[PDB]
């Protein structure tokens, strides 16, 4: 468990998880507001 | 025209980077502090200290010629 946590935070694994989360977030934002070329709210 | 002009600016800045870096570091740097005693053009300083390929100022000019050709192209 402790060693699993340690290995699960090593550079490659942490980076892949971070970028998967970022990709999912951006994908969902684009899905809800697609084809957005300007900021119209204000 | 906007996009291509910015490509032109990129080319100018990178060629100037290569040439300015080659000039200002000609007299020596941290990797080869005594470069001034080895002349303008020389192959390298051997594979020691991690490897010193293309460490001369002549080699900086050499790498800048490619970027000049690309930018003028």
């Amino acid at each position: 468990m402790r060693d699993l946590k340690t290995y699960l935070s090593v550079a490659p694994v942490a980076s892949t998880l971070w970028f998967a989360a970022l990709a999912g977030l951006l994908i969902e934002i684009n899905r809800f507001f697609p084809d957005a070329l300007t900021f119209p709210f204000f | 025209d906007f996009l291509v002009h910015h490509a032109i600016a990129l080319g100018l800045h990178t060629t100037t980077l290569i040439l300015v870096k080659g000039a200002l570091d000609a007299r020596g740097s941290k990797l080869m502090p005594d470069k001034k005693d080895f002349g303008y053009s020389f192959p390298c300083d051997g594979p020691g200290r991690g490897g010193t390929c293309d460490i001369s100022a002549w080699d900086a000019f050499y790498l800048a010629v490619f970027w000049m050709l690309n930018t003028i192209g």
Binding site: - | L3, H6, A7, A9, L10, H13, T14, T15, T16, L17, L19, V20, K21, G22, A23, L24, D25, A26, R27, K36, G39, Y40, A57, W58, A60, F61, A64, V65, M68, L69, T71, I72
Partner: protein, 73 residues
């Protein structure tokens, strides 16, 4: 078209040569003590800020120009 391409390529070669000979001067004809604290010596002593900022400009231009081109494509 021929004349324009002609003169632009020759101008690029001339500029690259000018920088090459600046580096050559640094190597050969530069006297650190006789140029103590003048503009040339001060250029030599903060070379790293110049090189780093020029690198930043190149990185910005390349990143964003290529990004916009690839986006449109």
């Amino acid at each position: 078209a021929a004349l324009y391409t002609h003169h632009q390529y020759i101008a690029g070669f001339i500029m690259t040569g000018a920088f090459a000979h600046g580096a050559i001067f640094f190597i050969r004809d530069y006297n650190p003590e006789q140029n103590a604290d003048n503009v040339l010596a001060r250029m030599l002593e903060h070379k790293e800020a110049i090189i780093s900022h020029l690198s930043w400009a190149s990185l910005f231009l390349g990143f964003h120009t290529l990004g916009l081109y690839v986006h449109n494509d």
